[PDB]
Amino acid sequence: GAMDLYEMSKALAVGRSPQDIAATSEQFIASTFHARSQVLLPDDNGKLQPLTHPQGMTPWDDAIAQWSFDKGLPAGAGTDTLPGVPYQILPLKSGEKTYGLVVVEPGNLRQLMIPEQQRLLETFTLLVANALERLTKLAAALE
Amino acid sequence: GAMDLYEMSKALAVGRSPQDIAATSEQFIASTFHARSQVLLPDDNGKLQPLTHPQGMTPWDDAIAQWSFDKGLPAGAGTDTLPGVPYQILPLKSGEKTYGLVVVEPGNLRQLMIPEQQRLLETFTLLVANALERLTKLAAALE
């Protein structure tokens, strides 16, 4: 919806932890894009977590997810890497830096892949990435 | 244009100072929205700077600008506060917090006020606000 990006931005602004940001992002991406989703974040070593998909999502390839994060490039539907899977693997990027990934599995892939929806989803991932960037850089500043 | 938000996000991601963010925001808002613009930022006391408009912009009311920043509410065209002026005064907000303002004076006010353009401009101000929030909170973390 028209107001969803603004409402998510309000919820992201008060997030205090990566898990807060992940939960908020999943709630809003699920509602706005009629999809199940999972945010994946790097650990100390740069390896994405969690490695276990949630009930209701089809399992994705962990190593292709890692590839998407490492390269800052999408995979899954709409790309030339795993073009046939029923989900998208999207980097959460601010500038050239990738702070995480979101796996998005819609109820209706033809609906999610409408170009206008793809452009809206890109704006969502940019706002999520900005929130992750803020928390990561602040924690580093202080710890 | 379709790619302008993404291109501005890349430029905002590498900004190192509020002045960097202000210059980038003015460049992209000017180009995308066919407008002159000025970003105003609070000083130590919460008073907006600069107090001097640039050549090519019509002077705005400094106290109404301060009102917009203090209340986190827009003024100027499209609002019930100074509805008749040929510019908009827009808070740069992330969540409930306002980090600055942008004054936008278009070459063609009827074009800027097209609702689709207004919705795009709101997304721009959200990305600018996120950049200002990141720099402000990081500087505080370190200084």
Swiss-Prot record, chains A, B:
Domain of life of the source: Bacteria
Q: Where in the cell is it found?
A: Cell inner membrane
| Similarity comment: family membership | In the central section; belongs to the universal stress protein A family.
Function field: Member of the two-component regulatory system KdpD/KdpE involved in the regulation of the kdp operon. KdpD may function as a membrane-associated protein kinase that phosphorylates KdpE in response to environmental signals.
Q: What is the protein name for this chain?
A: Sensor protein KdpD
Q: Could you tell me which species this protein originates from?
A: Escherichia coli (strain K12)
Taxonomic path: Bacteria, Pseudomonadati, Pseudomonadota, Gammaproteobacteria, Enterobacterales
